[PDB]
């Protein structure tokens, strides 16, 4: 099962050091987006990406109920990550607390030419976390829904695949 190799990987990565996934996973093609609720009063993380993307000007303002989304191209990746909450995800071991969808893709084209088309991996992963925030002194528990989009890598990269597209959707945050 790649995608629980992928998983397994990637989540504990992003817990203790998450910028190592972007050389690895990551390229100027790739896309990540975050959708967040800016009514939620002690949530770390729609504030962390609500300043975010007010000091780079990229926010449009919306009703306050409506749903907000951060995306980013390649650049942007690495210090959005960097404002993200740390995080400690559970293991998963623990078949309670995540449910892993991984499905075929065979739409996406092939880098090399070789062949017509090139097989693609989607990923969808409904988890939780405990996302803390020191600074600001909030801690809590996450409630997410991940998804990702995989195809073939460029030359030159470290691993046969790539992520095409990231996703992440930050549903509830509970305190203490």
Same mark, same amino acid.
């Given at each position: 099962?790649?995608?629980?190799?992928?998983?397994?990987?990637?989540?504990?990565?992003?817990?203790?050091?998450?910028?190592?996934?972007?050389?690895?996973?990551?390229?100027?093609?790739?896309?990540?987006?975050?959708?967040?609720?800016?009514?939620?009063?002690?949530?770390?993380?729609?504030?962390?990406?609500?300043?975010?993307?007010?000091?780079?000007?990229?926010?449009?303002?919306?009703?306050?109920?409506?749903?907000?989304?951060?995306?980013?191209?390649?650049?942007?990746?690495?210090?959005?990550?960097?404002?993200?909450?740390?995080?400690?995800?559970?293991?998963?071991?623990?078949? @309670? =607390?995540? &449910?892993?969808?991984?499905? #075929? *893709?065979?739409?996406?084209?092939?880098?090399?030419?070789?062949? +017509?088309? $090139?097989?693609?991996?989607?990923?969808?992963?409904?988890?939780?976390?405990?996302?803390?925030?020191? @600074? =600001?002194? &909030?801690?809590?528990?996450? #409630? *997410?829904?991940?998804?990702?989009?995989?195809?073939?890598?460029? +030359?030159? $990269?470290?691993?046969?695949?790539?992520?095409?597209?990231?996703?992440?959707?930050?549903?509830?945050?509970?305190?203490?």
């Amino acid at each position: 099962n790649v995608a629980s190799t992928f998983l397994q990987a990637f989540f504990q990565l992003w817990d203790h050091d998450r910028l190592t996934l972007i050389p690895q996973f990551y390229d100027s093609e790739t896309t990540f987006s975050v959708v967040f609720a800016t009514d939620s009063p002690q949530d770390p993380a729609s504030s962390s990406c609500s300043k975010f993307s007010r000091n780079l000007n990229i926010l449009s303002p919306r009703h306050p109920s409506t749903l907000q989304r951060l995306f980013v191209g390649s650049n942007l990746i690495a210090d959005l990550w960097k404002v993200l909450p740390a995080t400690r995800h559970p293991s998963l071991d623990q078949t @309670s =607390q995540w &449910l892993i969808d991984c499905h #075929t *893709f065979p739409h996406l084209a092939d880098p090399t030419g070789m062949a +017509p088309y $090139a097989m693609g991996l989607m990923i969808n992963v409904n988890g939780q976390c405990e996302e803390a925030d020191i @600074s =600001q002194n &909030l801690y809590g528990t996450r #409630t *997410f829904s991940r998804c990702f989009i995989l195809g073939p890598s460029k +030359p030159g $990269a470290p691993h046969p695949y790539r992520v095409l597209s990231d996703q992440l959707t930050l549903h509830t945050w509970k305190p203490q």
